[PDB]
A paper describes a structure:
The type VI secretion system (T6SS) is a bacterial nanomachine for the transport of effector molecules into prokaryotic and eukaryotic cells. It involves the assembly of a tubular structure composed of [name] and [name] that is similar to the tail sheath of bacteriophages. The AAA+ [name] [name] disassembles the contracted sheath, which resets the systems for reassembly of an extended sheath that is ready to fire again. The interaction of TagJ/[name] with the sheath as well as with [name] suggests an alternative mode of disassembly in which [name] recruits the [name] to the sheath.
We crystallized [name] in complex with a peptide corresponding to the first 20 residues of [name] (1MGSTTSSQKFIARNRAPRVQ20) or an [name] degradation product, which appeared during purification of the E1-B1 complex. Both structures are nearly identical to the structure of [name] alone, with an r.m.s. deviation of 0.4 Å in either case, and to each other with an r.m.s. deviation of 0.3 Å. The amino group of Lys9 of [name] interacts with the negative dipole of helix α7 and forms hydrogen bonds with two carbonyl oxygens at the end of that helix (residues 155 and 157). Another key residue for the interaction is Arg18 of B1, which forms two salt bridges with the carboxyl group of Glu273 in [name] (top right inset). The residues of B1 between 8 and 29 that are involved in specific E1 interactions are highly conserved (top). Residue 273, which forms two salt bridges with the conserved Arg18 in [name], is always glutamic or aspartic acid.
Numbering used by the authors:
A (entry chain A): 30 to 286
B (entry chain B): 8 to 20
Amino acid sequence: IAEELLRAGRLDDALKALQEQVRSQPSNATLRIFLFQLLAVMGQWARAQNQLKVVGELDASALPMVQTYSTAIDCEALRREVFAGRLTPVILGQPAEWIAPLLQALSLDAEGHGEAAQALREQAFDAAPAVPGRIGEAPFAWLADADTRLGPVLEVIVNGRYAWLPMSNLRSLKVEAPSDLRDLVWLPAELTLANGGATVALLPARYAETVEHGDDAARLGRKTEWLDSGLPVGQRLFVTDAGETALFDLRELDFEP
Amino acid sequence: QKFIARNRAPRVQ
């Protein structure tokens, strides 16, 4: 029934049912792993972390997953602080001068200086190089996040750390379709950097405002939309000169300088 | 417009 409720996008109803199942079979690690993922979809971060902790104690073979997603949940708090203009994220790879105005714009937004923040973003965008490439086989002249607070920047979690990766530093990105429920929140990825470095990563798959301001459909990534505030919720969306591609429909992204 | 989504209508996914 919980799977059915989830399919229908009835998150609260699903949560009710699943917690009753766990209460009935408290030693069942499979149910608690389901519950952690559902809690994460709903943005109940501390309760999600609680379930992970219990899973690690019930099944020591799940401990690597537990470490990975416990730190991923920690990163969502860091995410909030970065977009609130209160924290500088880790920057991956070669330094990019135009990242600084992007970050400063977040601070200026926080202080109600939206026009000045807009000016800094316009400058950052102008300075960031248009790098051609392809999404699978489909060419583009440039690519960015539909979120103007990022533009040509990818949010990543690497080794449990929240970071910004300028797309100009990226050679290729590979992802698969989401498979587990937690993949709607953090999509596993392989990244190769232009200067050679390669690493596995998690990609925060929804916009940061989704948990608080989105509806159930948004939290499940079944829509992308912009709030009256001007901020996006729902599934991450990439835009190019030629079209747009939602994250869960991306498989391979290659840049060719 | 470089890096800009021209459309901000709600998207179905």
